[PDB]
Design a protein around this ligand. Structure first.
Ligand SMILES: Cc1ccc(C(=O)Nc2ccc(CN3CCN(C)CC3)c(C(F)(F)F)c2)cc1C#Cc1cnc2cccnn12
Length: 280
């Protein structure tokens, strides 16, 4: 309502800055508090004098355009001068990889594994529809909140090893992306498949006992990860479709989401009945 108003910009002093999250594993991401409203937030920062200004500013632009229940939601930025902030709502249970590695499987049961996958493929259908490419989909890049709410994120984490002049997470990376640097919503589909396998194993590292140097060549001979113990057949079938060698042969996220939503609804019906028996 005044000449230098920007609806996304906040004042840094609105925000109480506290500890770095995850002991550094998320980069420059800090727990903060938006004082006026209490709200605990997460704050990504870039200090002055860096060669990352353009990339950070590009990140802010993108988030201003992303609005979905299962994608991280921008609350505000500080980008009028250094240090830059990007502020989003705090997700209390941390990243999905660790959550799966530390959980109680009585709570995180098979209906919850289906819930997680449905939420993630819904965030990816949205990106698919808006013609975005995530480019680093993985359980380390999903966040968990109350009642197994899952939101997709991207910390810019690049485990990652040297490849084609940069750092790639080989075991999540689609073949055309490794071979030709070709990234698309279809390579995200390949990665979602590895994420499904991460969920199914409660967070095991992919391609167990296989050294990264052998992954591409095995994939090119049509080797794929085997079905995890206890992974339902239909879910494995979806994994193998995400891992079609030709990107065009892989399902869309719309299709994947509809599949998971159906299975989640069926599973949830069984879950509520067992619980209703428990109560009583
Ligand atoms: C402070 C912060 C800043 C930024 C982001 C962030 O996720 N950035 C992001 C940037 C771009 C994109 C889309 N592009 C991907 C690349 N692609 C080439 C283009 C499309 C997306 C996506 F989610 F939409 F994918 C996310 C997360 C946080 C957090 C947090 C937080 C909240 N609670 C907790 C608890 C523990 C740890 N962290 N934490």
């Amino acid at each position: 309502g005044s000449p230098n108003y920007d609806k996304w910009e906040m004042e840094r002093t609105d925000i109480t800055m506290k500890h770095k999250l995850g002991g550094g594993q998320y980069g420059e991401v800090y727990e903060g508090v938006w004082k006026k409203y209490s709200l605990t937030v997460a704050v990504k920062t870039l200090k002055e004098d860096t060669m990352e200004v353009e990339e950070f500013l590009k990140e802010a632009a993108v988030m201003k355009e992303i609005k979905h229940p299962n994608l991280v939601q921008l609350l505000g930025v500080c980008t009028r001068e250094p240090p830059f902030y990007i502020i989003i709502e705090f997700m209390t249970y941390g990243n999905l990889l660790d959550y799966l590695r530390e959980c109680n499987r009585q709570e995180v049961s098979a209906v919850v594994l289906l819930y997680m996958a449905t939420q993630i493929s819904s965030a990816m259908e949205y990106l698919e529809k808006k013609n975005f490419i995530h480019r680093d989909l993985a359980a380390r890049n999903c966040l968990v909140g109350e009642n197994h709410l899952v939101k997709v994120a991207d910390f810019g984490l690049s485990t990652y090893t040297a490849h084609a002049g940069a750092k790639f997470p080989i075991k999540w990376t689609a073949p055309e992306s490794l071979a030709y640097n070709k990234f698309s919503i279809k390579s995200d589909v390949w990665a979602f498949g590895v994420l499904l396998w991460e969920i199914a194993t409660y967070g095991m590292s992919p391609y167990p006992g296989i050294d990264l140097s052998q992954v591409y060549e095995l994939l090119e001979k049509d080797y794929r990860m085997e079905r995890p113990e206890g992974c339902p057949e239909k879910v494995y079938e979806l994994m193998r479709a995400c891992w079609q060698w030709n990107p065009s042969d892989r399902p869309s996220f719309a299709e994947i989401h509809q599949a998971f939503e159906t299975m989640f609804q069926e599973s949830s019906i069984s879950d509520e009945v067992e619980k209703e028996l428990g109560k009583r």
